[PDB]
Write a protein that binds this DNA or RNA. Sequence first.
RNA 1: GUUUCUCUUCAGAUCGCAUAAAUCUUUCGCCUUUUACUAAAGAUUUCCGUGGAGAGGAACACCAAUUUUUUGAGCCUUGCCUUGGCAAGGCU
Lengths: 83, 73, 111, 94
Amino acid sequence: MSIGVPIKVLHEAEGHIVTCETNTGEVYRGKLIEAEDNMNCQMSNITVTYRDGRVAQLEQVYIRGSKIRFLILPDMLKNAPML
Amino acid sequence: AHPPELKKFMDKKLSLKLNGGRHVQGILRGFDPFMNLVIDECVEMATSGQQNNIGMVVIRGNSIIMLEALERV
Amino acid sequence: TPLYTDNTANGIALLWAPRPFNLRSGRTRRALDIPLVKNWYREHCPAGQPVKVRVSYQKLLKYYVLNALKHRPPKAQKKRYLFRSFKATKFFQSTKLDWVEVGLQVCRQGY
Amino acid sequence: SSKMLQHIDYRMRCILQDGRIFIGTFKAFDKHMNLILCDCDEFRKAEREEKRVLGLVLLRGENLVSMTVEGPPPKGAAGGPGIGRAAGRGIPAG
RNA sequence: GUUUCUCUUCAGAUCGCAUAAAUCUUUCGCCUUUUACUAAAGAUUUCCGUGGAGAGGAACACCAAUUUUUUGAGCCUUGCCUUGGCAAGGCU
């Protein structure tokens, strides 16, 4: 089906290191493992910034798709054969 | 396919962070295509850190905004 | 659609046919150029045949090898059509005639 | 589609749902109005004002309110047979 | 637009799934002599044909039920910020 260009670039992003910010204001920064077509991400080895300042480290995390409101994909992808 | 790839996480011990600033911690065994979870040995983490025990619970899919492992896959 | 059709048995067999028969399309050749008997003498024929022919086989290979060895590519010489240059001139005309009529004429002329 | 497609590769300013602003060079969009912005700035508002930098931002479609343009993009007949040469004229007799 | 005929230009190509002859330089051989030869090499040309491109003529012609788009909205109180608003927090 027409799953367009952005979600393909999301699959292309896997196995790198992405930053990912949720509705509430928590900022995650983690290594990606898999990402689904509705943007459910799994993420590994994270350094999370809380809304009010504090840092924490985490083992592994799974982030529901509709709860995101940007990712920061790693810049080298601008060359990729999707584009 | 439509189901979440949540198969890994099963029977390992999860924390969840739920809509509205609520927290629960769990040993997991459920999922369906909406991510409706069925959690076991489920503790409720109240604001004050006064903790409750409660039995097996369903969660609505849309209420989740993170799903974290307290002991690894 | 059926697993096989009547042409399927025949059509597979073309794939290992010799060089002019294994293709759907090609380009036409001159009657001069097709070597009809070439496939026979290129194979070492069964020795029970008389002595006379065996050496005749072998001496056919000699001229074959020499030609293909001493072959040089064409020199890219510029095209110049003889009979076109003739028929462009008032002294020549053209017509359609039986080969046997022309053959007698060439012998009469040459005489 | 066709109105959106006109914008491609320009430098686009987006206003998010929470009031934030992004400004970015624009190369993807999708049936849910997902976006990929590139070479991008996060920008907020004497009333104080501030400008943060982000890379290759992927915007889940739900957030978008509006987008606007303000930049230009981050981007015969053959020779014939005639020859000239020097010549004299030469007058004819008479 | 398909065929045809003619001309120009380039050919790298099994220009050819085929295969001729000539000249010269040498090594040979029958050999009075010379052609005509022999049979190997090399440099060469001639001839039978060919392809690509161009010019011109002629002849016939669809879904509002959690995962995005039919909305958890909206309302207050504290601190700072000259103000504006920001950091939030609390509600229904």
